[PDB]
Design a protein around this ligand. Structure first.
Ligand SMILES: *[C@@H]1O[C@H](CO)[C@@H](O[C@@H]2O[C@H](CO)[C@@H](O)[C@H](O)[C@H]2NC(C)=O)[C@H](O)[C@H]1NC(C)=O
Ligand code: NAG
Ligand code: NDG
Length: 544
């Protein structure tokens, strides 16, 4: 029997019973962003839900193939040699998929315990993806393991995943988009999905007054931008859109302006790869981009990734959230430090070796001059003095680079461990500490995951790896990532009924941090590489 829910008082949608979980997949929350609506803010859904058979995932939004990155990594270090088969199988499974990709992709999915009734008021967990090596948008993140575990725990939740536009489709900047007021469209997509949840989740048995948003990599960077959206106003028609958050390996971005990697403006490069004439006026280039087929814009996006992000650099360094004076009113770091953020409790953490999967971009660097040149490209407006100070704080000494704590092993090149440490701390660890020290009036918890230490040559406990334990095979540290986060969605404290180590909250006095291992966890403090990370937190002259 198909489970049902009724929206707008009388429109009945049906889902699919999958074991003991009811699923409703492919629910539209905005009108399709096609033709004249390409690159514009999401428009209200003007259709009908009546008779919708929400029985399969919608198309994924336009994105790059993970194969680009996985093949470069494989060329650089031989993934089948370094990653144990039990983790490698899952990792490649999340990088492929049966869903198509299409610009018509603004849909969400609801997962709940079978037989939940609309009056149940179950806590809601809303997942926002952003995995560097994952294909499929929400289709790669089924909520069944989270829902099944919350039932076993006696703490049932509703899980929701939302699609949003990434890349140039969701974050095309430039003067024409600014003049239209259509900046940061992908962030507005997420916010519209959250409005849909506030208005409609009670019909599925969820509680609109207890919503947790969480995500990983660009999804955690998105959650951090939702916390400072409109200077911390997370209300919609008087109601708070979310009440707690978890950020897995991502935080605010250090930009104070719409900058991107390298010597050229990202808009200009993409327009050029799409075959538009970049000497025409701003409005004419945007009109040209709105006339191209999706395959042409897809090839153009692929060329920007391979040529300008070198197939590996985090996508938000090219097309991503930037200050626009409206949904992001000022630089993200400054909004957190002036208290202009939503006052909700959160968990923020990192994998030990966040930078190792990105370090192969600088594989040809053997000397400090070579590393300086790569850093001058990625951070093109950085002052030379600021770069020189980073290079003195992160030396080429093999034992202090990343994979961390591995001595003289894993030195793929003379500079690989150094570049992996710099990218780790600049892009992931410093953003986490900017939030933890700025948000002193909310409860917060932080973690370091070291569970693959010494099991994966050259990569260590790398960026994006923990997603296989949350969404694919529930082995290794899966119980920590499932149960602490279910407890947090229910009680805004990770320690209720987990049967796991007590995780003490982070305080400014003790800087308490959970360290997650393969089978056990231990408490530690967030005390490592203080000088190096602190400099990234405070040197504004690095960023552009
Ligand atoms: C490492 O590779 C990069 C990318 O090919 C080289 O940098 C380029 O060098 C040419 C000539 O100086 C410039 O026109 C490019 O614009 C540079 N691009 C970047 C991203 O820096 C770099 O010279 C190589 N380093 C070594 C030691 O060979
Ligand atoms: C460009 O488009 C904007 C927003 O649609 C409009 O207000 C402006 O007049 C246009 N300007 C030119 C020079 O075409
Ligand atoms: C939709 O139909 C099912 C019967 O399969 C029923 O249990 C459910 O209550 C209906 N939905 C609502 C919200 O009435």
């Amino acid at each position: 029997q198909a489970p049902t829910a009724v929206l707008n008082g009388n429109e009945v949608i049906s889902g699919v019973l999958e074991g003991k979980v009811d699923t409703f997949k492919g629910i539209p929350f905005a009108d399709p962003p096609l033709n004249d609506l390409r690159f514009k803010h999401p428009q209200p859904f003007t259709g009908s839900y009546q008779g919708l058979k929400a029985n399969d995932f919608s198309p994924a939004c336009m994105q790059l193939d993970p194969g680009n990155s996985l093949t470069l990594l494989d060329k650089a270090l031989g993934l089948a040699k370094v990653i144990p088969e039990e983790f490698r199988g899952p990792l490649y499974d999340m990088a492929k998929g049966t869903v198509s990709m299409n610009e018509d992709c603004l849909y969400l999915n609801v997962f709940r315990p079978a037989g939940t009734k609309p009056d149940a008021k179950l806590p809601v967990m809303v997942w926002i993806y952003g995995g560097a090596f994952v294909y499929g948008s929400s289709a790669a993140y089924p909520g069944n393991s989270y829902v099944k575990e919350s039932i076993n725990m006696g703490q049932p939740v509703v899980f929701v995943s939302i699609n949003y536009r990434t890349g140039p489709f969701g974050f095309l900047g430039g003067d024409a988009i600014t003049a239209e007021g259509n900046t940061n469209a992908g962030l507005h997509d997420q916010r519209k999905g959250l409005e849909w949840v506030s208005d409609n989740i009670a019909n599925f048995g969820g509680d609109p007054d207890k919503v947790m948003i969480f995500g990983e990599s660009a999804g955690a960077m998105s959650v951090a931008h939702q916390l400072i959206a409109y200077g911390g106003d997370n209300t919609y028609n008087g109601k708070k859109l979310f009440h707690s958050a978890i950020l897995q390996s991502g935080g605010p971005l250090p930009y104070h302006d719409s900058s991107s990697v390298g010597p050229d403006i990202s808009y200009n490069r993409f327009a050029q790869y799409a075959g538009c004439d970049t000497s025409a006026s701003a409005n004419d280039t945007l009109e040209c981009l709105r006339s191209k087929s999706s395959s042409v814009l897809h090839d153009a996006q692929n060329s920007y990734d391979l040529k300008d992000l070198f197939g590996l650099l985090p996508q938000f360094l090219g097309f991503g959230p930037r200050p626009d004076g409206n949904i992001i009113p000022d630089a993200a770091y400054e909004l957190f430090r002036s208290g202009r953020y939503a006052k909700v409790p959160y968990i923020s953490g990192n994998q030990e070796d966040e930078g190792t999967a990105f370090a192969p971009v600088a594989l040809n660097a053997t000397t400090t001059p070579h590393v300086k040149k790569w850093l001058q490209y990625i951070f093109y407006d950085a002052s030379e003095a600021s770069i020189d100070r980073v290079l003195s704080l992160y030396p080429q000494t093999l034992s202090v680079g990343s994979p961390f704590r591995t001595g003289i092993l894993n030195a793929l090149t003379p500079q690989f461990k150094r570049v992996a440490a710099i990218l780790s701390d600049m892009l992931f660890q410093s953003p986490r500490r900017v939030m933890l020290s700025a948000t002193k009036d909310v409860n917060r918890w932080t973690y370091l995951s070291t569970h693959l230490h010494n099991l994966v040559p050259f990569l260590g406990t790398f960026h994006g790896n923990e997603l296989i334990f949350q969404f694919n095979v529930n082995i290794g540290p899966a119980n920590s990532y499932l149960r602490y986060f279910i407890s947090f969605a229910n009680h805004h404290d990770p320690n209720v009924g987990t049967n796991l180590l007590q995780w003490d909250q982070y305080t400014d006095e003790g800087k308490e941090m959970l360290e997650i291992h393969m089978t056990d966890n231990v408490m530690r403090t967030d005390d490592y590489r203080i000088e190096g990370i602190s400099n990234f937190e405070t040197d504004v002259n690095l960023y552009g």
